[PDB]
């Protein structure tokens, strides 16, 4: 049994330090790390005993008394966003490999938006007539998007979009309703957004 | 105290 | 405090007869303190040991649990080995392992060991430096690549440099009233007529411990190491050992021979000869 | 890598389900795990070749697993219950202690009645002229609503070919009726291209939603079309202006 | 790779007619570990017999000790019967008070 933070944040291009505590570890116990990208199966990252295990993308440092350890990603990227698990498969010799992923740590990797221009536009249907959607986009990663206070209003989580060739990454959230006592000026009122957010006429 | 071997040949 | 703790494992497949059998006996020099057998009806160690039973129930359950995890590991190994050598499923095979550590009076580690054998022949052993392997044939080489890729040596080195030593100089202290002791040999020399011109002179050494010992004959000071019959050291069935050296001598010169006995439980090498009565 | 089937399954409370796993060839060890929403995978059973040696994780008698020739493995669940809804993972390896390679897993959902299964409606929202002006960029938004179970795969298609560059889909669906326990789901995605690309009327933009629902073996007495595995898409043409 | 077992039959203590003692039959140096051992008294098998726990030497060969309490006499004969995969026929070694 191990324990680690429920979540951690980081910006792309930065080394990430994921901690883990395993107080009752044995001298024969190996420290393994697995991760699970969104809607995918878990995958192996690295494993070690005592000495530091280095590798291109991720290295592992183990405390001298071995009651704590850190998984080190030398340069986070958006693809590195996922759940990381600290595991002791052998359990002092009482186990054989069977994996006990705990809760793990959800690593969110925020993009470095180097050219903010927050705004909330209103998008029309291409087929219906009175269906509208609000799009809050181009805001920097400091900004967090919270869920509306209304049950008639739905809001997605912010997600990173990357226009691959022009390498233009940008954040964006979407809100929408069935009502119409719903404009975009009030859509994200339950969120702390940039005072200079642009609201078209 | 027995060694806990897990890696088979 | 100069001894050694060693484990002797055995895994023997029993295709066409039942399930595999597994044995794991522990040793501290010439004294067995623990025993784990897969045929045991309740996990009681039919080889229990004083200084061992003084540890809690956590210890005994913990070891018992590790042992059972190991029966699975060895079960996987037998099946892989069966494949590396292309053997059928019916044939019965054996896998044995020997590991432990030696210490000096210091108490610290002098050397660590970890060797495996298949069907009675060496397979793979851990090197002096406890960081590399030595594969006998090309099948063991398969296990070699596998073990270093997974960096298994580090877990072996860690057990030997730590657990093995730590627990040894704990068994030594909890049983200093038995493990550091030495039982000296009781020695007498019998005379057995072969015929008219010959007779056997047998030199016995009984009730000693440890097993280590050296019996030597001599004719007028000349070592008879060549023409001497010598049996294999045998257990008496009470933690003690026996052994005897014998030489054939012509009826009459049986006074020119002397037996020499060397043993830790002896203050000084002993010298003896046959005395009629 | 490791394969698993089916990738998606919807079951009525009380029926039996069968999941399958095809491990990497040659791998001796094979493990099964169950993963419920927000939780980490949970060990279920283990196989050393064809022999199941550790089943300490099987919830009850309802779960039965096999692996006849020590290769393909089957996990069958009798009388499925709501607590069975989870993603079942499969992992194989060189030996019990070596690194495990997992499969894409089977996403299983257990509902009370198949009448709860609804395919998604799909709508495409066109880029605002405000966004075009302000940034010379255009963001198309796709909205998939009213589906159940939560088994959908959304993709974007431009002029016939599938696109990835410039796409951002929600990792997880929003519940439409959070309060209710049979709430259907809504998913959202975005495709962003430059103004001059969306301003070419001859460019075709299609939002595709692959829905996984009832199969032939499933019974259907309702009057509305059987919610079968189908794809539902919405399209939009570039607007000059 | 098999090795035939060596047999030694002897008493724990030097035999003295009348004094209770222990009869031993030490089988060693064999492979594989499967082996059948019986202590005999005037050709007939002794049923009151216990044995040590299997284990092996550095050379990987196994060894075992079978034993039974007894009181030597003048006419009585004792022997050890051993069967093993490496033996065409059972190996029998008579107990010799002087060896």
Name the descriptors.
heteropentamer; B: 9 residues; little secondary structure; 0% helix; C: 277 residues; alpha+beta; Murine Class I Major Histocompatibility Complex, H2-DB, Chain A, domain 1; Immunoglobulin-like; 2 domains; five-stranded antiparallel sheet; 4 helices; 24% helix
Walk me through this protein's architecture.
Chain A: This is T cell receptor alpha chain constant. Chain A: It is found in: Cell membrane. Chain A: Glycans are attached at residues 144, 178, 189. The complex is a heteropentamer of chains A (201), B (9), C (277), D (241) and E (99). Chain A has 201 residues and is mainly β. Chain A folds into 2 domains: 1-111, Immunoglobulin-like; 112-201, Immunoglobulins (Immunoglobulin-like, Sandwich), CATH 2.60.40.10. Helix content of chain A is 2%, strand content 36%. Chain A is built from 1 helix and 13 strands; from the N terminus they run βββββββββββββα. Chain A has one helix at residues 184-187, and strands at 7-11, 16-21, 31-36, 43-48, 58-62, 68-73, 82-87, 105-110, 119-124, 132-137, 154-155, 159-162, 169-176. In chain A, the strands form 3 sheets. In chain A, strands 1-8-7-3-4 form a 5-stranded mixed β-sheet, with no helix packed on it. In chain A, strands 9, 10, 11, 12 and 13 form a 5-stranded antiparallel β-sheet that branches. A 3-stranded antiparallel β-sheet of chain A has the order 2-6-5, with no helix packed on it. The longest helix of chain A is centred in the last third of the chain and has 4 residues, at 184-187. The N and C termini of chain A lie far apart (57 Å). Chain C folds into 2 domains: 1-181, MHC class I-like antigen recognition-like (Murine Class I Major Histocompatibility Complex, H2-DB, Chain A, domain 1, 2-Layer Sandwich), CATH 3.30.500; 182-272, Immunoglobulin-like (Sandwich), CATH 2.60.40.10. Chain C is globular, with a radius of gyration of 24 Å. Chain E has 99 residues and is mainly beta. In chain E, the strands form 2 sheets. In chain E, strands 1, 2, 5, 6 and 7 form a 5-stranded antiparallel β-sheet that branches. In chain E, strands 4-3-8-9 form a 4-stranded antiparallel β-sheet, with no helix packed on it. Chains in contact: A-B, A-C, A-D, B-C, B-D, C-D, C-E. Chains A and D meet through β4, β9, β10, β12 and β13 of A and β4, β9, β10, β12 and α1 of D.
